[PDB]
Structure 1
């Protein structure tokens, strides 16, 4: 734990002292070293310690950091996917922004204090406002959308944290507190409602993904959407269970509506990144609802399905970024004959699209089975509703694949050696998790 935190603090530190020509190499080495430190944290985490594997405090309640089942999975996932982001991004400015964002996000996951969680997570507010609103390829509207949505939801969460700190005297997770108030429960809930894109607060995610860089999109999809489940398991369910059980019909209404309308909105997309971004929104609802059941199956299934999403959607975003570099287009209608023109890119694209459709040899299958089993434990109709409307995803995925597959094209647009190096780890991890090493 201490080694992981030290390395997380070391990565932004190194950029200040590097030569500004060695920045990429030093950043890549630092990212791999942080991954190794995360593996060490996993090694030193004994399953005998059932509640929390590790807890460290550095002199205050705010400096209390700890790893649990959800935290450990999410932290390993972010440390796994960061190096790919590092290689995809060029320039000292971009490297600095992405390193600071990753440091803040990775410190948020292991934090055990709601106020420190808020402080670390929202520190990356301007960095995305600048990142998504970059000079030539960015849009100011999307940056405004994401920044305002995050600010309002996080401020509601902050108000609830202040009320808890006033009443209980503490806001740390390790101190058992329960509240039945609905205002505080909604204050904590609204952040989850916005951060995990859930209709009708999902509008920020699409505009952000399309106008963010490929490394930015990879991080956003990979771990920033998963921060919702760390907040839910760590800071909402322990204290706000009475409210989630009181509002369960409403929770199901909103979750299933998000699933259905996000699936239907995906059908109206002509941009590849928008297609992947809307697939993410439909995928988040099952996670949110499975956790909300507050059962052993639901929590495990949600964290598993988060890992599956954080291995599948970064791959699709990376492949789309590679294709956009090769073609300078993201419109499906311009892109044809990709099967003949890019056999190696097409194979991986089809593999990852099959993963997104939750086919058996992929982690999404196991994760979906567990989540659907939890929903079936609550009620049969709950699982039946989700299982049927999964067919909408097949329609748009198949239409996109058919449009890209064949036609007449005069351009060889296939990936280079650097690109294949970029996705090889994701493919290997996807296979390893798919065979059951979840």
Structure 2
């Protein structure tokens, strides 16, 4: 806690820096995000897999704010703390630094929360931050921010009466006592399903993301892609299954059919997209639906498989966003028909595009492949029909992926030259992490 407060105060020192010394401004802004990465590394070195299912427990008196660490939260924290410095490497204004610092603080605080009211309070404290981020004056879209903010607020407002009702029912808001009291599982279950089906892109209420993640700049795009959807999955795992199992069971056909139709329609809709950024936007929907079905399956190893898939997407998809952002910034447009002959023009960049495309398509020597194998193992053990439905449409995503890749990469050379040292460095952590987790993730 003390260390965390020290980082919190140290990050705020950015505003106190006079703008005259830009060099030190960049150094301080980057280092402030560097530190938590090492801190989470130190935590992982401190964790015990032979110890309790929860470790490093701390409570701030009667102020709720229960913080504890499982494997899922620690892994998500590690992935986020890897992602954020790259986002910092793509910003040029102090306001962006402050917004992303607050966003990272909120994400980290929510990632290890153990109070449902605490999760409610801490999660959506960044909604105004996203609103200011997405609808920036020169290049953003106000409509996308309006959409996403309204969707999130609708979810939270639906959830809140359920949260306070179970609080009054059990007299507290701690998960480890909420999980131990009898409760009216149904109402809280509807609240949780609504919120985490809005957060994770699930049909029908998922339409904010395609506009939002495209209107946002590169850093915010990577943040939204790799973080806030996983807040939904960790939300399920940490709260809904431990608290209300009967609702989870009675809704399982509904959740499964909704996830399946979401995956199918998103996969089919993607082929008709005409912009690379929108193509990348629809890509994440199938992954999130697969994660949700894997979580809801609970067959053999569902939590671990879901965590693996969440890590895999938060690793690979930001690379797609990095390539998209580089191409747009050094091209001033995102429209596909202006992309051609990229391999001869951007050899290393196009090679990375190929590699991360394969990563999206679940191919061996990549963490996504093992992730989807484990998720389909969990799904299959529940039933084989759902596993077949996931297996049958594997071709349909790779269809649009390969079509877009070949269309923009091969052909007549026209456009930007290859990537720069900064861009290759930004690409680097995702490549190394994906290789490491696709060769020997465990030991």
TM-score (norm 1): 0.97
Q: Matched residues in 1 for 2:352 and 2:2: separation?
A: 38
Answer whether contact 1:180 1:243 (CA < 8 A) is retained: no
Q: Matched residues in 2 for 1:410 and 1:184: separation?
A: 55
Give the superposition deviation at 1:177. 3.3
Identify the match of residue 317 of structure 1 among 312, 317, 321: 321
Give the superposition deviation at 1:296. 4.3
What's 2:409 paired with? 405
What's 1:185 paired with? 189
Task: Give the secondary structure class of the aligned counterpart of 2:244.
Answer: helix
Answer whether contact 2:312 2:367 (CA < 8 A) is retained: yes
1:203 matched to 2:202? The reply is: no
Answer whether contact 2:300 2:381 (CA < 8 A) is retained: no
Answer whether contact 2:339 2:414 (CA < 8 A) is retained: no
Identify the match of residue 97 of structure 1 among 69, 75, 99: 99
Identify the match of residue 239 of structure 1 among 237, 240, 243: 243
TM-score (norm 2): 0.96
Q: Which runs of 5+ in 1 are unaligned?
A: none
Residues 52-91 of structure 1: CA deviation (Å, up to 9, x unaligned): 0221112235221111121111111111111001111110
Answer whether contact 1:327 1:413 (CA < 8 A) is retained: no
- Once the two structures are overlaid, the 10-residue window that deviates more, 23-32 or 357-366, is 23-32
Answer whether contact 1:178 1:238 (CA < 8 A) is retained: no
Q: Matched residues in 2 for 1:171 and 1:296: separation?
A: 30
Give the superposition deviation at 1:433. 0.6
- Once the two structures are overlaid, the 10-residue window that deviates more, 152-161 or 196-205, is 152-161
Residues 189-216 of structure 1: CA deviation (Å, up to 9, x unaligned): 1011100000111101111110001000
1:375 matched to 2:375? The reply is: no
What's 1:265 paired with? 269
What's 2:289 paired with? 285
Identify the match of residue 172 of structure 1 among 161, 171, 174: 174
Aligned residues: CA RMSD: 1.4
Residues 145-184 of structure 1: CA deviation (Å, up to 9, x unaligned): 0000000111222222111111001121122335343222
Q: Matched residues in 1 for 2:297 and 2:355: separation?
A: 32
What's 1:362 paired with? 366
1:18 matched to 2:17? The reply is: yes
Answer whether contact 1:11 1:31 (CA < 8 A) is retained: no
Task: Give the secondary structure class of the aligned counterpart of 2:54.
Answer: coil
Alpha carbons of structure 1 residues 8 and 153: separation in structure 2 relative to 1, 3 Å: farther
Answer whether contact 1:362 1:435 (CA < 8 A) is retained: yes
Identify the match of residue 32 of structure 1 among 31, 34, 42: 34
Identify the match of residue 89 of structure 2 among 87, 97, 112: 87
What's 2:139 paired with? 137
What's 2:113 paired with? 111
The aligned length equals: 437
- Once the two structures are overlaid, the 10-residue window that deviates more, 95-104 or 48-57, is 48-57
Give the superposition deviation at 1:421. 1.1
Answer whether contact 1:75 1:106 (CA < 8 A) is retained: yes
1:6 matched to 2:10? The reply is: no
Q: Matched residues in 2 for 1:140 and 1:180: separation?
A: 40
1:212 matched to 2:211? The reply is: no
1:428 matched to 2:415? The reply is: no
Task: Give the secondary structure class of the aligned counterpart of 2:205.
Answer: coil
Residues 258-293 of structure 1: CA deviation (Å, up to 9, x unaligned): 100010111111111111110001110010011012
Give the superposition deviation at 1:137. 0.6
What's 2:47 paired with? 45
Residues 114-146 of structure 1: CA deviation (Å, up to 9, x unaligned): 111111111101111111010011001100000
Q: Which runs of 5+ in 2 are unaligned?
A: none
What's 2:255 paired with? 251
Answer whether contact 1:323 1:413 (CA < 8 A) is retained: no
What's 1:150 paired with? 152
